Amino acid sequence: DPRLAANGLRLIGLERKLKALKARLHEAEKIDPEGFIKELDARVSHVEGTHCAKKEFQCGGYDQECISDLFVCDGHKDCHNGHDEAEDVCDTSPVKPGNIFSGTSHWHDCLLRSDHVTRVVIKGTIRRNYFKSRIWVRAQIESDLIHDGKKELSDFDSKGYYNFANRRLVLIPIAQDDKHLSVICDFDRGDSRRASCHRVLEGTLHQCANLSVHLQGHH
Protein backbone atom coordinates (compact mmCIF):
# COMPACT_ATOMS: atom_id res chain seq x y z
CA ASP A 1 0.00 0.00 0.00
CA PRO A 2 2.04 3.00 -1.34
CA ARG A 3 0.10 6.25 -1.03
CA LEU A 4 -3.07 4.27 -1.62
CA ALA A 5 -3.46 4.52 2.15
CA ALA A 6 -3.13 8.31 1.93
CA ASN A 7 -5.87 8.43 -0.68
CA GLY A 8 -7.95 6.33 1.68
CA LEU A 9 -7.45 8.96 4.37
CA ARG A 10 -8.56 11.61 1.85
CA LEU A 11 -11.69 9.55 1.24
CA ILE A 12 -12.47 9.45 4.97
CA GLY A 13 -12.03 13.21 4.90
CA LEU A 14 -14.53 13.57 2.08
CA GLU A 15 -17.00 11.35 3.94
CA ARG A 16 -16.66 13.61 6.98
CA LYS A 17 -17.16 16.69 4.83
CA LEU A 18 -20.31 15.29 3.22
CA LYS A 19 -21.73 14.51 6.63
CA ALA A 20 -21.06 18.11 7.69
CA LEU A 21 -22.71 19.59 4.58
CA LYS A 22 -25.77 17.41 5.05
CA ALA A 23 -25.87 18.82 8.58
CA ARG A 24 -25.73 22.37 7.17
CA LEU A 25 -28.92 21.70 5.19
CA HIS A 26 -31.10 22.29 8.29
CA GLU A 27 -29.61 25.76 8.75
CA ALA A 28 -29.84 26.42 5.01
CA GLU A 29 -33.59 25.79 5.06
CA LYS A 30 -33.97 28.73 7.47
CA ILE A 31 -33.20 31.07 4.54
CA ASP A 32 -35.82 31.73 1.87
CA PRO A 33 -34.59 34.43 -0.55
CA GLU A 34 -37.55 34.13 -2.92
CA GLY A 35 -39.99 34.14 0.00
CA PHE A 36 -38.25 37.12 1.60
CA ILE A 37 -38.58 39.12 -1.59
CA LYS A 38 -42.22 38.02 -1.94
CA GLU A 39 -42.85 39.28 1.60
CA LEU A 40 -41.20 42.63 0.92
CA ASP A 41 -43.17 42.94 -2.32
CA ALA A 42 -46.33 42.32 -0.31
CA ARG A 43 -45.51 44.89 2.37
CA VAL A 44 -44.35 47.55 -0.06
CA SER A 45 -47.44 46.96 -2.19
CA HIS A 46 -49.50 47.51 0.94
CA VAL A 47 -47.78 50.82 1.65
CA GLU A 48 -48.40 51.83 -1.96
CA GLY A 49 -52.12 51.03 -1.89
CA THR A 50 -54.07 50.79 -5.16
CA HIS A 51 -56.20 52.92 -7.45
CA CYS A 52 -58.91 50.26 -7.45
CA ALA A 53 -62.22 50.60 -5.63
CA LYS A 54 -63.12 48.48 -2.65
CA LYS A 55 -64.24 45.00 -3.76
CA GLU A 56 -61.96 45.35 -6.79
CA PHE A 57 -58.83 43.37 -7.70
CA GLN A 58 -55.90 45.04 -9.41
CA CYS A 59 -54.46 42.86 -12.16
CA GLY A 60 -50.67 43.04 -12.37
CA GLY A 61 -48.39 44.68 -9.85
CA TYR A 62 -47.74 47.77 -11.93
CA ASP A 63 -50.75 47.07 -14.17
CA GLN A 64 -53.67 49.50 -14.27
CA GLU A 65 -56.56 47.13 -14.88
CA CYS A 66 -59.18 46.53 -12.18
CA ILE A 67 -61.61 43.62 -11.91
CA SER A 68 -64.52 42.71 -9.63
CA ASP A 69 -63.39 40.46 -6.78
CA LEU A 70 -66.38 38.28 -7.70
CA PHE A 71 -64.39 37.36 -10.81
CA VAL A 72 -61.18 36.34 -9.06
CA CYS A 73 -60.31 32.65 -9.40
CA ASP A 74 -63.72 31.86 -10.86
CA GLY A 75 -62.22 29.96 -13.76
CA HIS A 76 -62.52 32.75 -16.31
CA LYS A 77 -59.72 34.97 -17.59
CA ASP A 78 -60.90 38.52 -16.77
CA CYS A 79 -57.62 40.42 -16.62
CA HIS A 80 -55.97 41.46 -19.90
CA ASN A 81 -52.99 39.50 -18.50
CA GLY A 82 -54.94 36.71 -16.80
CA HIS A 83 -53.59 37.55 -13.35
CA ASP A 84 -56.99 36.97 -11.72
CA GLU A 85 -56.55 33.27 -12.51
CA ALA A 86 -52.80 33.02 -11.79
CA GLU A 87 -51.56 30.18 -9.59
CA ASP A 88 -50.13 32.37 -6.83
CA VAL A 89 -53.40 34.28 -6.69
CA CYS A 90 -55.60 31.18 -6.73
CA ASP A 91 -53.55 29.10 -4.28
CA THR A 92 -55.99 27.38 -1.94
CA SER A 93 -53.49 26.31 0.70
CA PRO A 94 -54.05 29.10 3.23
CA VAL A 95 -57.26 27.29 4.10
CA LYS A 96 -56.23 23.70 3.41
CA PRO A 97 -58.06 21.68 6.07
CA GLY A 98 -55.67 20.27 8.64
CA ASN A 99 -53.79 23.56 8.82
CA ILE A 100 -53.27 24.80 12.36
CA PHE A 101 -52.25 28.44 12.53
CA SER A 102 -50.96 29.49 15.94
CA GLY A 103 -50.13 32.92 17.29
CA THR A 104 -50.19 35.28 20.25
CA SER A 105 -53.35 37.28 20.86
CA HIS A 106 -52.77 40.74 22.30
CA TRP A 107 -55.98 42.25 23.65
CA HIS A 108 -56.70 45.98 23.87
CA ASP A 109 -60.51 46.20 23.94
CA CYS A 110 -63.64 44.13 24.70
CA LEU A 111 -61.90 41.55 26.91
CA LEU A 112 -59.39 42.00 29.69
CA ARG A 113 -57.03 39.12 28.89
CA SER A 114 -53.25 39.07 29.13
CA ASP A 115 -51.26 37.96 26.07
CA HIS A 116 -52.12 34.38 25.13
CA VAL A 117 -51.94 31.66 22.48
CA THR A 118 -54.74 31.33 19.93
CA ARG A 119 -55.10 28.66 17.25
CA VAL A 120 -57.14 28.83 14.07
CA VAL A 121 -57.72 25.19 13.09
CA ILE A 122 -59.01 24.65 9.57
CA LYS A 123 -61.60 21.86 9.75
CA GLY A 124 -63.14 21.93 6.28
CA THR A 125 -63.62 23.70 2.96
CA ILE A 126 -66.33 23.79 0.33
CA ARG A 127 -65.69 25.21 -3.11
CA ARG A 128 -68.69 25.25 -5.42
CA ASN A 129 -67.77 24.54 -9.03
CA TYR A 130 -70.38 27.10 -10.05
CA PHE A 131 -68.83 29.78 -7.86
CA LYS A 132 -65.08 29.40 -7.41
CA SER A 133 -64.52 33.04 -6.47
CA ARG A 134 -64.58 32.06 -2.81
CA ILE A 135 -63.87 29.11 -0.54
CA TRP A 136 -66.29 28.44 2.29
CA VAL A 137 -64.24 27.60 5.36
CA ARG A 138 -65.18 25.89 8.59
CA ALA A 139 -62.72 26.10 11.46
CA GLN A 140 -62.17 25.74 15.20
CA ILE A 141 -60.81 28.65 17.22
CA GLU A 142 -58.91 27.59 20.36
CA SER A 143 -57.36 29.81 23.05
CA ASP A 144 -55.07 28.80 25.91
CA LEU A 145 -56.09 30.99 28.84
CA ILE A 146 -54.17 30.94 32.12
CA HIS A 147 -57.17 32.57 33.80
CA ASP A 148 -57.25 31.54 37.47
CA GLY A 149 -53.83 30.22 38.50
CA LYS A 150 -54.39 27.12 36.36
CA LYS A 151 -54.63 26.68 32.57
CA GLU A 152 -57.92 26.31 30.66
CA LEU A 153 -58.81 25.88 27.00
CA SER A 154 -61.43 28.22 25.51
CA ASP A 155 -62.53 26.91 22.12
CA PHE A 156 -65.43 27.44 19.74
CA ASP A 157 -66.67 26.25 16.35
CA SER A 158 -66.77 28.86 13.56
CA LYS A 159 -67.54 29.33 9.88
CA GLY A 160 -66.75 31.81 7.13
CA TYR A 161 -64.79 32.13 3.90
CA TYR A 162 -61.45 32.72 2.22
CA ASN A 163 -61.53 35.34 -0.52
CA PHE A 164 -58.66 35.06 -3.00
CA ALA A 165 -58.57 38.66 -4.19
CA ASN A 166 -57.76 40.30 -0.87
CA ARG A 167 -56.29 37.08 0.54
CA ARG A 168 -58.64 37.24 3.49
CA LEU A 169 -60.04 34.57 5.79
CA VAL A 170 -63.15 35.62 7.70
CA LEU A 171 -64.38 33.35 10.48
CA ILE A 172 -67.46 34.25 12.49
CA PRO A 173 -68.58 32.07 15.43
CA ILE A 174 -71.08 29.37 14.51
CA ALA A 175 -74.23 30.00 16.56
CA GLN A 176 -72.04 31.35 19.37
CA ASP A 177 -73.91 34.21 21.02
CA ASP A 178 -71.68 33.30 23.99
CA LYS A 179 -69.38 36.31 23.52
CA HIS A 180 -66.85 34.64 21.24
CA LEU A 181 -65.37 37.26 18.93
CA SER A 182 -64.92 36.74 15.19
CA VAL A 183 -61.49 36.44 13.60
CA ILE A 184 -60.22 38.04 10.41
CA CYS A 185 -56.88 36.99 8.94
CA ASP A 186 -54.96 38.52 6.06
CA PHE A 187 -52.38 36.33 4.35
CA ASP A 188 -50.40 39.45 3.51
CA ARG A 189 -46.89 38.17 4.19
CA GLY A 190 -46.24 36.83 0.70
CA ASP A 191 -46.99 33.22 1.56
CA SER A 192 -49.70 30.80 2.65
CA ARG A 193 -47.99 30.17 5.94
CA ARG A 194 -48.33 33.41 7.91
CA ALA A 195 -51.23 35.78 8.45
CA SER A 196 -51.94 39.10 10.16
CA CYS A 197 -55.15 38.59 12.13
CA HIS A 198 -57.60 40.45 14.35
CA ARG A 199 -60.29 39.41 16.76
CA VAL A 200 -63.25 41.56 15.72
CA LEU A 201 -66.94 42.14 16.36
CA GLU A 202 -68.81 40.77 13.36
CA GLY A 203 -71.33 43.58 12.97
CA THR A 204 -68.92 46.52 13.15
CA LEU A 205 -65.51 45.02 12.32
CA HIS A 206 -64.13 46.79 15.38
CA GLN A 207 -60.72 45.38 16.25
CA CYS A 208 -60.48 44.12 19.84
CA ALA A 209 -57.22 42.20 19.53
CA ASN A 210 -54.06 41.99 17.43
CA LEU A 211 -53.05 38.47 16.42
CA SER A 212 -50.33 37.16 14.13
CA VAL A 213 -50.51 33.51 13.21
CA HIS A 214 -47.94 31.31 11.53
CA LEU A 215 -48.56 27.78 10.29
CA GLN A 216 -46.10 25.80 12.41
CA GLY A 217 -48.68 23.02 12.52
CA HIS A 218 -48.64 19.69 14.30
CA HIS A 219 -50.24 20.08 17.72
Partner 1 sequence: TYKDRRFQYILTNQHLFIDKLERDLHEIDDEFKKLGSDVKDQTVRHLKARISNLEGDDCKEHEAPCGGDVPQCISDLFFCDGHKDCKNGRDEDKEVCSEVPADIGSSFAGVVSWQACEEATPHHAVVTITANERKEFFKPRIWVRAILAFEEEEHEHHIKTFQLRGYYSFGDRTLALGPERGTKPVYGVRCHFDRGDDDHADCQIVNPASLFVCGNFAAERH
Partner 2 sequence: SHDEEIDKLNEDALKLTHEIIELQEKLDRRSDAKRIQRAGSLKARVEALEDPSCPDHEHQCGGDDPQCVSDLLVCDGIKDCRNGDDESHCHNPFHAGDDFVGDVVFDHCTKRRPENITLSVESISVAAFFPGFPKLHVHVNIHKETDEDEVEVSLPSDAIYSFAEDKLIVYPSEDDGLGLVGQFDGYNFDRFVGDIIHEASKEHCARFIFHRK
Q: Which residues pair with 126 in a beta bridge?
A: 136
Look at residues 193, 200, 196, 201 and name the one whose alpha carbon lies nearest to residue 211: 196
Which of partner 2, its own copies, Ca ion, none interacts with 5 (beta carbon under 5 to 8 A by kind)?
its own copies
Instruction: Decide: helix, strand or coil at residue 139.
Output: strand
Q: How far is the CB of 65 from partner 1 (least distance, A)?
A: 5
Q: Is the dihedral of CA 209, 183, 216, 45 positive or negative?
A: negative
Q: Length of the chain in residues, anyone?
A: 219
The stretch near partner 1 (CB under 8 A) out of 45-53, 139-147, 171-179, 210-218 is 45-53
- Ranges within 31-60 binding partner 2 (CB under 8 A): 31, 33, 36, 40, 43-44, 46-47
Q: What angle do CA 208, 122, 106 make, to 5 degrees?
A: 25
Beta carbons of 208 and 201 less than 8 angstroms apart: yes
Q: How far is the CB of 6 from its own copies (least distance, A)?
A: 4
Q: Is 179 left (phi over 0), alpha (psi -120 to 50) or beta?
A: left
Residue 84 is a binding residue for Ca ion (CB under 5 A) = yes
* Site track for Ca ion across 26-65, x = CB under 5 A: ----------------------------------------
The stretch near partner 2 (CB under 8 A) out of 4-12, 62-70, 81-89, 143-151 is 4-12
- Ranges within 66-125 binding partner 2 (CB under 8 A): 103-104, 106, 115
CA distances from 185 to 94, 151, 201 (A): 10, 26, 14
Q: How far is the CB of 50 from partner 1 (least distance, A)?
A: 11
Q: Return the number of the residue (144 or 202) whose C-beta is nearest partner 2.
A: 144
In DSSP notation, 112-162 reads -PPSEEEEEEEEEEE--TT-TTEEEEEEEEEEEEEEESEEEEEEEEEEEEE
Phi then psi for residue 118, to 5 deg, are -130, 140
Q: Return the number of the residue (12 or 31) whose C-beta is nearest its own copies.
A: 12
Interface contacts to partner 2, rule CB under 8 A: 2-4, 7, 10-11, 13-14, 17-18, 21, 24, 27-28, 31, 33, 36, 40, 43-44, 46-47, 103-104, 106, 115, 194, 212, 214
Q: Where along the sequence are the contacts to its own copies (CB under 8 A)?
A: 3, 5-6, 9-10
